[PDB]
Amino acid sequence: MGRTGLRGRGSLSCFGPNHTLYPMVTRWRRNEDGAICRKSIKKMLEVLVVKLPLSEHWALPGGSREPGEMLPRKLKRILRQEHWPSFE
Amino acid sequence: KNFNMKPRLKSIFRRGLVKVAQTTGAWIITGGSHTGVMKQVGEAVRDFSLSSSYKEGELITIGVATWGTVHRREGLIHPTGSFPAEYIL
């Protein structure tokens, strides 16, 4: 995607693509009995985002190839702290 | 649908539309609900009748809308016949 003028760092911990995923959990949202977005005409959406307490933004699980494991297991980079090992 | 124009047009149209119905004693047949051009005419009455809130020249804006596109059809029914009731926007 063109030179960004940088190093070769292991901020990715990987000299490569690091093919990651983002489980866009999507509630086509509601009101007392079912709503849309009246703002333009469209539909309003609700998304679970987790605020990590240290970094100051609100994010989603980065499925970025858990070391030794696959991509649906760095899906459980944060989703192991959502307590279920049942549904996979 | 809602819309925003130049504030010079707002300061002309919302001012003069009061100055029609102030002098003539007119009626303003509008479209009812809270969104769009019918919202902007309700701005102009609010821009007069609480700032220069004059009984002299009580503007009459008659809203014609759809009982069925209204957001709270419930809480407004009374086979009793008369009510000084309320609802919440």
Curated annotation (Swiss-Prot), chain B:
Changing residue 38 to A: Abolishes lowering of temperature threshold for activation in response to reactive oxygen species. Abolishes channel activation in response to ADPR/Ca(2+). Homotetramer. Isoform 1 can interact with isoform 3. This interaction decreases Ca(2+) influx through isoform 1 and suppresses susceptibility to oxidative stress-induced cell death. Highly expressed in brain and peripheral blood cells, such as neutrophils. Also detected in bone marrow, spleen, heart, liver and lung. Isoform 2 is found in neutrophil granulocytes. This is Transient receptor potential cation channel subfamily M member 2. The chain holds residues 178 to 266 of 1503 of the full protein. Belongs to the transient receptor (TC 1.A.4) family. LTrpC subfamily. TRPM2 sub-subfamily. It is found in: Cell membrane; Perikaryon; Cell projection; Cytoplasmic vesicle. Contains two binding sites for ADP-ribose, one in the N-terminal part of the channel and the other in the C-terminal nudix hydrolase domain. Both sites seem to have a role in channel opening, but the interaction of ADP-ribose with the N-terminal site is absolutely required for channel activation. It comes from the Eukaryota. ADP-D-ribose 1 binds at residue 2.
